[PDB]
């Protein structure tokens, strides 16, 4: 209803361009181990320092509408490339800004840019399959350290002290990142827990930063069945509330009225309170139920064997831990005061009924309950002597395990921007079908070498030689930006996970391509 | 009572005229296979890249009063298009600005505007006789993909995946659209079924795009009686409330007070309720309203036979879903929870009843309860790597469907802009009754000539010598603008439902031709 | 209280002439068959497109006051014609117009603007007797189509079947006028009625169009006696509203409390309910209302008789009414959903009780019984590819519905305004009393040229050589403006009714010779 303006062709082009160029450029000059930091104001407290390219792009908006709508879809690439990845948002941002300067130069009167972006994807899908056969899956301790140093801006502590924790608790153990008091980071094994499912309602949310739940020494209520009616609870609210303990309760679905009268107490008097669905289908649900119960020392309510109710529920039937962060990715359950011998007793029945199972599924899941009332979580505490440094290095340290993830999950390739480098004869070997097509290929061509040579930038070098030289290089000869020497990146551990890789491309190009397939743009006019 | 500026003549009218032509200039370039896109700002979050002309066309409001009737005018057009076909509206939009510019090149001070329109729309319905003689219809599967394919922008998979829908549920099946959490689109077989009946009330509405409303694993309270008194609502209101879950109630006729407790407590705290309108009329009905029953796994309630009233009201008597849609054109249900023996036993009996019923109208009514109950229903899933791309191409797969149940419902005639062209010879033969009705008649003469100039010229070649050679052509013969060829449009697919040409025909028509029978314009000071 | 601003004489006087200029001139354009349409911009949603004189009027209010005071002096001119004649506010728009200009240039220090008045009023007197005197009544349905075409803007196929409509249900006959979804208009007889009986409360508004309450599917309590006890009410009123329906109440007099609590409660709950009075007086009323509780299917209260009690409600004693319309003006109930054997037997009975009665005073009243319990309702669907269209549509429907009626009432006269110039040698003959009543005189003289000279000037010819040539023909010959010729008005079927000519003279006259009496105004600051 409100009036608009509207712009046309170039014009509106090179202003959605001028804010794609202040939001990568912003961005490109974190690339990298000679990367410089980024200072965001706050509106409360103390300004942060971040390297994180998403981190940047998501703080930068900008008063004209055409610049900000072209800073939006880079800041939908950055955080596309976060979500689905975790690193590699630098990199994405400045592929995305790369294939929408190439994309707008193209565009001309008898060009079909729908059709250049067909190009882009399949281009994209070449190089992602070649990816793919470059990729080398991870199989020592060592090459984690690597990744985790690498994705950490070359930091060899906080490498060192993830290798050691998924040494400990596993490949596919639960790490935790946490302030720290000290000026020293520090590894912690505790006895804890997480599932897959998140929060319900998004009114359960009080740390405005990660957006998750963080309570701490909380009630636990379990249910088989669904915790429903207001009679059965009131009783459970009202003695969890009087009491000095934030209730969680595990029900199987919570849409509705006792679901918005947690909303609204939250809101009016400020009940500390979450809903979390049920993992797991049949019996299993029941099993990691009773296996939580036990773990957290409360009771089982809404079962078949007991039928117990929750009209009537005690005080001594909430189990108490000592922490709960509830993400909408995963629900997690620290430090719980169950007792010993139950959660011993539970593991040998576990053990007894691992020991009876040869069905290569029910064994993976018995498995899988074995190694969290056993294996326990990691926790990673990061120090630092003020807040701004700890926040600081705990992006690096959220990144670096992100990465580890992904490298333990698919693989990892040559770091540098070299792996995207590796891929440009895959393009050359492609047959377009027209000239939009191989308009678009070549975009894709052109845009694999800014990685690399935004890395060299930083670094104080000339990237188009140092690309022009990795090129005429060998396969596994790559640019040491940080000694600004031709190694071999595998035997230096410089290397990236594939996963992070064939994201950023993606999430740049398919963003970017749509952005220049656009004749027409339409804004509010200011007030 | 706001003071008015009044505006006379051709001032005013070349001021509508701006308004028109700035609305329609900004929907004409996504016309056709070479037609680019629109990106629009939105106030939350992303911003919104479109190749739909009602949408481009709703987007923009002027601030100069004059102009923004105009544009008002033509976004009537483009909506009623919308509206009643689904597809060609930006077809709409032009053939909208050309008549009313044509309109007001020919107002003098002799001429009757009056009686131009009245030319306009003989005109108009002599195009659509001779549209309906040139339409054939739908025989092959092949058809509807190249329909698909068409209204697709030329996208091969969504046409092969809309195909593969009417293949498995039917030419007259229903089929959803959905977003997809991957890369590629996908088609599912899903139980589930629709009816015609809409909301009762417009205070259900949580998604704000398409107005409609979407609850997951709610209950469903049916009754063949009218679910009216507070004593007979208010306790199965509270077990149902008390209950976590969505509501779905089914009445006959809710015109009084009970859902308007029931959105006076949605705008309070947030009670999450549908009431619908129960359909079919009589036995039918209440056939319907068992077939549903048994589906969902609830009970009937009100009936004649086993006399169930509406206050005992038990937990396990209403029907579990897993999903409901409630437009206002339509309701459906998605993965009903009822039992499977339950469900087969009434498919056994509805096979019993057809056996034995030769009337032909209980037999297709049957036909259809069958199919509801049996036959299911197909989702596509929209796959992208953003929400903007996934949102783009979930506009040109509702085109696409919208357009091949159209194509089903009255057939084929050819695309590119020809078949409006192949009409030009039945304005032709007419004899006006004046001289004011053949300027209307020789008005929409120049106007059916503007699609096809349109899509030559998105394609970047000059319209006017391409139009003039498709009609120096043979009548099958016209203008591939994505190859760039002169082709036999029905082999090569190029081919449009008869329904969206003559839609978008009589919608623009209407609106432009009543818009240039204005002498005197209105409007409000602007504070 | 707040400061003033005061003009005299010929200053305060030509901005007011301003302002009736400008109003008169946006009406002006719309008159007769080659009249054009007036585009008002509308706040909510799409532009009103109107030849409707009083649409226009209504819609203009100026920003400088001196002008807006002549601006709303005409709108109360088109308002009073629209009023009690539902047709002709054009042409009493520029009657006041002629009347306001030649009174306003008459003005000196020797002149007495209230003795021209009393000039004015003296020669309207003497044109509404010769227009008496020159009306003939209709007699045949030709003439009904005639002038049903002529009212709907030349028209042929509304006159058509207003002609039908009125065949079908009696001259006197029901006929309402809603939207088609079509693009034709239609006519259905349907079973209904009518009472001539505002509704006391102004505060049970849902259309702003129409100012009428519009109910889909009400109750019927109907009572005889006053409505009063609260106590008793309550329960009617909540079984009412409770059970999912409004209500609409039959009462003898509301003038307190349980009314303005149903306006209150509307205002904040919105329970949906009506009061209007009851038709008749005496036992004519209580037989009506017997009629119409068989007619609606519902039970009597507060009958002698029975005492029946207002608490005592049963869950069907309210009657069912599919379509309420009560207008300020009437109350009207469609669709009543009576028992059919019940109202045949009361129509039986009604003959009954035809067969003996010779009184032909209360006999009439039950004549008036036998016509609306059986003889039906019309209703005409106006149809249209838009709603701008159906409503421009809609406004000349209304028009030709209302001029029909008014020919019915009190003949024709000739159309084009030639009956007003057959009135001049009315005037000649008049013998003035002073100089003052003379100028009056030849006032309105000179004004009863100006119908025909809009029409032949919106015609684009010169309207005083048209004007001259009629004068000088035959009484029977007139302009017919839409084909340009001299022709037999009545035989060409350009006729108006007498009623709407005499009407709109008469209310240009009254405020336009007060308004020329005006030596002072008072206006307001602006703020
Ligand atoms: N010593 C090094 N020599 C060369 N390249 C290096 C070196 N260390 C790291 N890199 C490369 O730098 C890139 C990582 O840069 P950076 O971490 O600043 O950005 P990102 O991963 O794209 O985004 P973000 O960390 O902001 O989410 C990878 O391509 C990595 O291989
Ligand atoms: N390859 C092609 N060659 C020629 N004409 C084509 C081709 N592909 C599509 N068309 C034509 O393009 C038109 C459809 O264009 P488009 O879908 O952009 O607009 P629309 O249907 O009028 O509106 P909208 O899709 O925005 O609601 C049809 O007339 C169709 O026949
Ligand atoms: N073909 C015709 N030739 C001459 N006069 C005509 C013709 N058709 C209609 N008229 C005259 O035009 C007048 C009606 O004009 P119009 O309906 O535009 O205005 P109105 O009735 O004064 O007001 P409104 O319809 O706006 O309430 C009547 O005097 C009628 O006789
Ligand atoms: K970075
Ligand atoms: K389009
Ligand atoms: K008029
Ligand atoms: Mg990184
Ligand atoms: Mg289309
Ligand atoms: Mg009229």
Redesign the interface.
């Given at each position: 209803?409100?009036?608009?303006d509207?712009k046309?062709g170039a014009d509106a082009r090179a202003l959605?361009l001028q804010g794609v160029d202040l939001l990568a450029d912003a961005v490109a000059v974190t690339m990298g181990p000679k990367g410089r930091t980024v200072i965001i104001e706050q509106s409360w407290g103390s300004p942060k320092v971040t390297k994180d390219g998403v981190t940047v792009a998501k703080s930068i908006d900008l008063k004209d509408?055409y610049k900000?709508?072209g800073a939006?879809?880079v800041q939908?690439?950055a955080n596309?490339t976060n979500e689905e990845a975790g690193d590699g948002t630098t990199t994405a941002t400045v592929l995305a800004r790369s294939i929408a300067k190439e994309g707008f130069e193209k565009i001309s009167?008898?060009?079909?840019?729908?059709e250049i972006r067909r190009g882009v994807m399949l281009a994209v899908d070449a190089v992602i399959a070649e990816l793919k056969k470059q990729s080398k899956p991870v199989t020592t301790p060592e090459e984690i350290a690597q990744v985790a140093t690498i994705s950490a801006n070359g930091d060899k502590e906080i490498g060192n002290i993830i290798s050691d924790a998924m040494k400990k608790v596993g490949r596919k153990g639960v790490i935790t990142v946490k302030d720290g008091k000290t000026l020293n980071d520090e590894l912690e094994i505790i006895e804890g827990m997480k599932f897959d499912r998140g929060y319900i309602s998004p009114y359960f949310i009080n740390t405005s930063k990660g957006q998750k739940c963080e309570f701490q020494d909380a009630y636990v209520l379990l249910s088989e069945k669904?915790?429903?009616?207001?009679?059965s609870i009131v009783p459970a609210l009202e003695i969890a509330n009087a009491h000095r303990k934030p209730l969680v309760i595990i029900?199987e679905?919570?849409?509705?009225?006792?679901?918005?009268?947690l909303?609204?107490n939250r809101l009016k008097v400020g009940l500390q309170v979450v809903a979390v669905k049920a993992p797991g289908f049949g019996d299993n649900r029941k099993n990691q139920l009773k296996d939580m119960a036990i773990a957290t020392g409360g009771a089982v309510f809404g079962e078949e064997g007991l039928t117990l109710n929750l009209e009537d529920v005690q005080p001594h039937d909430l189990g108490k831990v000592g922490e709960v962060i509830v993400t909408k990715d995963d629900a997690m359950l620290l430090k719980g005061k169950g007792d010993k011998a139950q959660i011993e007793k539970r593991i040998q029945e576990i053990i007894e009924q691992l020991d009876v199972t040869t069905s290569e599924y029910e064994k993976e899941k018995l498995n899988e309950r074995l190694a969290k009332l056993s294996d326990g979580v990691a926790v990673l505490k990061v120090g630092g002597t003020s807040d701004v440094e700890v926040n600081e290095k705990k992006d690096r340290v959220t990144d670096a395990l992100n990465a580890t993830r992904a490298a333990v999950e698919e693989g990892i390739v040559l770091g540098g921007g070299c792996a995207l480098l590796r891929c440009i004869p895959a393009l050359d070997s492609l047959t377009p079908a027209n000239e939009d097509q191989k308009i678009g290929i070549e975009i894709i061509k052109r845009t694999l070498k800014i990685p690399a040579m935004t890395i060299a930038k930083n670094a104080g070098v000339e990237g188009s030689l140092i690309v022009e030289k990795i090129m005429q290089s060998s396969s596994e000869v790559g640019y040491d930006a940080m000694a600004g020497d031709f190694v071999n990146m595998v035997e230096k551990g410089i290397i990236d996970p594939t996963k992070v890789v064939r994201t950023a491309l993606?999430?740049a190009?398919?963003?970017a391509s749509?952005?220049t397939?656009?004749?027409?743009?339409?804004?509010?006019?200011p007030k």
């Open positions: 209803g409100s009036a608009k509207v046309f959605m509408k900000n709508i939006k879809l939908d690439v596309n009167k008898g060009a079909n840019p729908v669904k915790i429903s009616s207001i009679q029900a679905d919570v849409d509705g009225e006792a679901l918005s009268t909303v609204l993606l999430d190009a398919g963003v749509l952005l397939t656009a004749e027409v743009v339409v804004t509010e006019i």
